[PDB]
Amino acid sequence: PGSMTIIEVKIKKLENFLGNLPEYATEHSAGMDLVAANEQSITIKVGSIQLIPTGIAIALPESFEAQIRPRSGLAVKHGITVANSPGTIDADYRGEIKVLLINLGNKDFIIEKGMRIAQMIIAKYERVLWAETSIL
Template sequence: MSEAPRIAVVRLPHGAGLALPSYATAGAAGMDVLSAETVTISPGGRHAVATGLAVAIPPGFEIQVRPRSGLALKHGITVPNAPGTIDSDYRGEMKVILINLGDEPFLIERGDRVAQLVLAPVSRATWEEVERLDDTARGAGGFGSTGGHSRLG
């Protein structure tokens, strides 16, 4: 197995004393990232939660920002643009956009785990305009065309 990519990180003043993002278990795909602020998100409300960190992601990679499953299930707290993307050329503070889909205000305290970060390779593509696409068994069948729940047709 090759060496893991290194991510340069700058701790901003309001991130002092907080742990860096880390894997909770040996098999975890995502690193838990902590809030650097205390904020309450009202039902239906959104907030870009400060992490107190700025990063330099290696070229050819992105960091995907994903919800924490426990927050989503128990409280309706999720990442509305999941997965969010942090590009390799961004150098500002890493923030996590959260939305409260629950019925109660949700308090996030400084140091709480608010999301997962997944380092992922990025492929860059070029568009090639053609006159016709190749045929497939599915063809142009769209939403629900491959089956699924009987009521959805």
């Protein structure tokens, strides 16, 4: 394990947060595991959508975005996925990160605090300047 290129990102624990900040499973992971921080159990009925808090807020540096993506095993095993995927967190969004889950499986599913519910991948984006034309 040698040198590594990182981007430093400010993050705040809110009152409902427990445990560690979002972690990369390994040194080779593209995404950090987001963890449910709802104080009381949340049931997602078949077909229903529920917003799940994470208890963290971040301030991304300019030109970097955080993508909220589905955790694959949850979709494969329970049909649980991220209803607004991929979620876009940019430097403007400094409120609590919340994961919008939908139950597209065949059984009701309970979200409990501590459950891994989504992945967060940080990447660069570009800024477009439009050049309007009548011929493409």
